[PDB]
């Protein structure tokens, strides 16, 4: 199953959108990100693509940098590799 | 059009699964040191460019200090990254 903001963010191209766009990514989530210079989608797009896309070493990542669980970081992990699969 | 040809192939479709050597700028002695540094497909040097907020200066000096690309060769990989970014990001 997966949320509408999923589905919103996995339709189109990213552009500018702000980090608080991908799914999982809440307001204190996006706070946090934001405070550590990951302050557009496209900059967390970035770490999952020098992760090389890996599942667990981005999801840690995440945890790691804003404090996401496991939910959250898997719909964000989701959302990015389904953006890549249509865009990229 | 002054760019190369490698340039105009690469910012004409996505990237997919293509290797670093693809890029504008990344020869095969610049791309194996690339490859050598965990850098093995373009994605994952389109990645560096993002993680830098496709800063000019952050991303030409990583390129120097990672592979030991010349001015030439970081403006054309930069220059390639960007327009790739404009027209499918």
């Given at each position: 199953?997966?949320?509408?903001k999923?589905?919103?963010?996995?339709?189109?191209?990213?552009?500018?959108?702000?980090?608080?766009?991908?799914?999982?990514?809440?307001?204190?989530?996006?706070?946090?990100?934001?405070?550590?210079?990951?302050?557009?989608?496209y900059?967390?797009?970035?770490?999952?693509?020098?992760?090389?896309?890996?599942?667990?070493?981005?999801?840690?990542?995440?945890?790691?940098?804003?404090?996401?669980?496991?939910?959250?970081?898997?719909?964000?992990?989701g959302?990015?590799?389904?953006?890549?699969?249509?865009?990229?």
């Amino acid at each position: 199953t997966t949320s509408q903001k999923h589905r919103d963010f996995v339709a189109e191209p990213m552009g500018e959108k702000p980090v608080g766009s991908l799914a999982g990514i809440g307001e204190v989530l996006g706070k946090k990100l934001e405070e550590r210079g990951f302050d557009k989608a496209y900059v967390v797009l970035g770490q999952f693509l020098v992760l090389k896309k890996d599942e667990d070493l981005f999801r840690e990542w995440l945890k790691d940098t804003c404090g996401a669980n496991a939910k959250q970081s898997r719909d964000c992990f989701g959302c990015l590799r389904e953006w890549c699969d249509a865009f990229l």
